[PDB]
Structures are given as structure tokens and as C-alpha cells.
Design a binder for this molecule. Structure first.
Ligand SMILES: Cc1cc2nc3c(=O)[nH]c(=O)nc-3n(C[C@H](O)[C@H](O)[C@H](O)COP(=O)(O)OP(=O)(O)OC[C@H]3O[C@@H](n4cnc5c(N)ncnc54)[C@H](O)[C@@H]3O)c2cc1C
Ligand SMILES: NC(=O)c1ccc[n+]([C@@H]2O[C@H](COP(=O)([O-])OP(=O)(O)OC[C@H]3O[C@@H](n4cnc5c(N)ncnc54)[C@H](OP(=O)(O)O)[C@@H]3O)[C@@H](O)[C@H]2O)c1
Ligand SMILES: [Zn+2]
Ligand SMILES: [Zn+2]
Ligand SMILES: [Zn+2]
Ligand SMILES: [Zn+2]
Ligand SMILES: [Zn+2]
Ligand SMILES: [Zn+2]
Length: 255
């Protein structure tokens, strides 16, 4: 891993907690769905975390979709994460450290032939799919594309305008769906992805089945969502985890 100096060119504050950074950095070409590392000097030490590219690999304007992390530590204190709020405080012109070579296997080349490719994401994890769909390479292999974005509230569906523009571009091949867990909102299904798969509601709304005979499922995001969806698909649909030596029906990347 080689660190290069990047320059923030744009900061888009979708909500109080959700933001996308546009960066100029001399990174190497990458495969859509891959991630790199962003770094900032905090108390004299470089602090680094992984962030997925949201931009098509053919676009030199690097885009990152992030959330300022908040958690309850072991002492019972409610605290912010180390790097995310520092990334949220960057302004155009500010420097950010970027790893030149991308990493990751959450890519189309790892996806076998299928009728329907399901792209399921929570929160900021819609990013890799947007990189894949914007580029449009190798989607000819799949008859149907389903992009599902789950978040807590409708206001958190930051890329809904891009999803709508991608739906128009794909002329019916791409089906889009938003999911909201903490409210009811017009145009969105209410709940969590595993429960909506199990109840048959997601498939009924989309108009396509999710089964081992026709589908490949990509999972990105919340580690509990990834773990719960993989357990449901294995237990109830006999869909196996795709691992380095054992191919399968599910490709996962937790954040
Ligand atoms: C391959 C990969 C790709 C990723 N891509 C992105 C991306 O594109 N966009 C993005 O926003 N994040 C992404 N992440 C997460 C990212 O790398 C950071 O973990 C995140 O920004 C928090 O780092 P931090 O320094 O702010 O928090 P830290 O100081 O590291 O605190 C993390 C603590 O809070 C918990 N935690 C971490 N994330 C969350 C969360 N989202 N919700 C609740 N608790 C959490 C951890 O379990 C840990 O206990 C990705 C992670 C991986 C593994
Ligand atoms: N400061 C703020 O106002 C603010 C706002 C948003 C986020 N944050 C911080 O950002 C972080 C994560 O935020 P996020 O909302 O982007 O991502 P997230 O917590 O992963 O939630 C995204 C979606 O995933 C769902 N989910 C959670 N566990 C699941 C499981 N086991 N199975 C299926 N779906 C599951 C959530 O449902 P549920 O509704 O059931 O959780 C929600 O619909 C946290 O650190 C949070 O505290 C802060
Ligand atoms: Zn520049
Ligand atoms: Zn540019
Ligand atoms: Zn702990
Ligand atoms: Zn190298
Ligand atoms: Zn076919
Ligand atoms: Zn081709």
C-alpha cells in the first residue's frame, strides 16, 4: 500500500450525518465495486479506514459516501468514531491521504452467470453498486438487475436521484427499490431486508424471485444485516456463501 496526497474538491452534506466527498488523487485504475483507504493525521499518527469508490472507474473524480459513526463504547459513553467525523470536517481544498491501489473482491468478475443479480445494500454500502452500474461494464451477462437500498428513514436515501437516472438508462433491465426501517414512506417498503425477503414482500414488489435456480445475491453493508441475510438464504433457500475456493450464490462485503 502506497499513500498519495488527495485534494477534496466537493463535500455534499446529504443529511447531518451522511456526506459524500469528491477527491482528486493520483490513484491507480480500479475495478468497480472495490475500495481504497482514506487517511488523516490525528494526534501525530495517520488513522486509516476503508472506503468504497462510488464513482465509475472511468471517472477521475473519486467519490466516497460516508456516515459519521456514533457508538456506545465499553464504558457506557456515547462517542464518535475516530476517523469519520474528521473526514466530515474536510472542506474543498483540504488534503486527504489516499491509498493508490484498490483492494477487494466485491466485483462482477467474482459473480457467476445468473438470470437475476440482486444488489442489496444498507446505509452507505450502496456505493459499490453505484460504481458498477455507472460504469455499465459486464452487465450483459445478467438478464435482470435489482438494486435494493435500505436505510433508517426516507431522508437517508441519498442516491435515490442517481438510482432513478440509472433505472431510466437501463430501460427496464434494472429494477430499483428503497427500504425504510424506522418509518412508513411512499415509494419505500417498510422493514429490514431479511424480513422482507422471508415474507416474500420484496420479491412480490420487484416482480422477480430470489432463488438458487435463477439468482446471485450481492450483500453489502451492516455486518448484522450481511450475517442475518446469509443465514436466512442458506437455511431457507439453500443458497451458499461464495468463498475463495468454493463458488456460490452469495457475494458479501460487510463494512
Ligand atoms: C471493506 C470496507 C469498506 C468500507 N467502505 C465504507 C464506505 O464507503 N462508507 C462508509 O461510511 N464506511 C465504510 N466502511 C467503514 C469504514 O471503514 C469505517 O469503519 C467507518 O468510517 C468508521 O470508522 P471510524 O474511525 O469513524 O470509527 P472507529 O473509531 O473505528 O469506531 C468503530 C467502532 O464503532 C463500530 N462501528 C463501525 N462502523 C459503524 C457503523 N456504521 N454503525 C455503528 N457502529 C459502527 C465498530 O464496531 C467499532 O466498535 C467500510 C469498511 C470496510 C471493511
Ligand atoms: N448523528 C445522527 O443523527 C446519525 C444518523 C444516522 C447514523 N448515525 C451513525 O452512523 C452509523 C450507522 O448508520 P446507518 O444508519 O448509515 O447504517 P446502519 O446502522 O447499518 O443502518 C442501515 C439500515 O440497516 C438496518 N439494519 C441494522 N441491523 C440489521 C440487521 N441485522 N438485518 C437487517 N438490516 C439491519 C437498519 O435497521 P434498524 O432501523 O433496525 O437499525 C437500517 O435500516 C452509526 O454509527 C450511527 O450511530 C448517526
Ligand atoms: Zn485536482
Ligand atoms: Zn476532477
Ligand atoms: Zn468492546
Ligand atoms: Zn502494488
Ligand atoms: Zn441466462
Ligand atoms: Zn460483454
Amino acid at each position: 500500500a502506497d499513500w498519495v496526497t488527495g485534494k477534496v474538491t466537493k463535500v455534499q452534506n446529504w443529511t447531518d450525518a451522511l456526506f459524500s466527498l469528491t477527491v482528486h488523487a493520483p490513484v491507480l485504475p480500479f475495478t468497480a465495486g472495490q475500495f481504497t483507504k482514506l487517511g488523516l493525521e490525528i494526534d501525530g499518527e495517520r488513522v486509516q479506514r476503508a472506503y468504497s469508490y462510488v464513482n465509475s472507474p472511468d471517472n477521475p473524480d473519486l467519490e466516497f459516501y460516508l456516515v459519521t459513526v456514533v457508538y456506545t463504547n465499553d464504558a457506557g459513553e456515547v462517542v464518535k468514531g475516530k476517523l469519520s467525523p474528521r473526514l466530515a470536517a474536510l472542506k474543498p481544498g483540504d488534503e486527504v491521504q489516499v491509498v493508490s491501489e484498490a483492494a477487494g473482491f466485491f466485483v462482477l468478475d467474482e459473480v457467476p452467470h445468473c438470470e437475476t443479480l440482486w444488489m442489496l445494500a444498507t446505509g452507505t454500502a450502496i456505493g459499490p453498486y453505484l460504481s458498477i452500474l455507472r460504469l455499465g461494464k459486464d452487465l450483459d451477462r445478467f438478464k435482470n438487475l435489482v438494486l435494493v437500498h435500505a436505510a433508517r428513514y426516507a431522508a437517508d436515501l441519498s442516491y435515490l436521484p442517481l438510482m432513478q437516472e440509472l433505472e431510466k438508462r437501463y430501460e427496464g433491465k434494472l429494477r430499483i427499490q428503497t427500504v425504510v426501517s424506522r418509518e412508513t414512506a411512499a415509494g419505500s417498503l417498510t422493514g429490514r431486508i431479511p424480513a422482507l425477503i422471508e415474507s416474500g414482500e420484496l420479491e412480490s414488489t420487484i416482480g422477480l424471485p430470489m432463488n438458487k435456480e435463477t439468482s446471485h445475491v450481492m450483500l453489502c453493508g451492516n455486518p448484522q444485516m450481511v450475517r442475518d441475510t446469509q443465514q436466512l438464504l442458506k437455511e431457507t433457500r439453500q443458497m451458499t456463501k461464495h468463498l475463495r475456493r468454493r463458488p456460490g450464490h452469495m457475494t458479501a462485503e460487510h463494512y
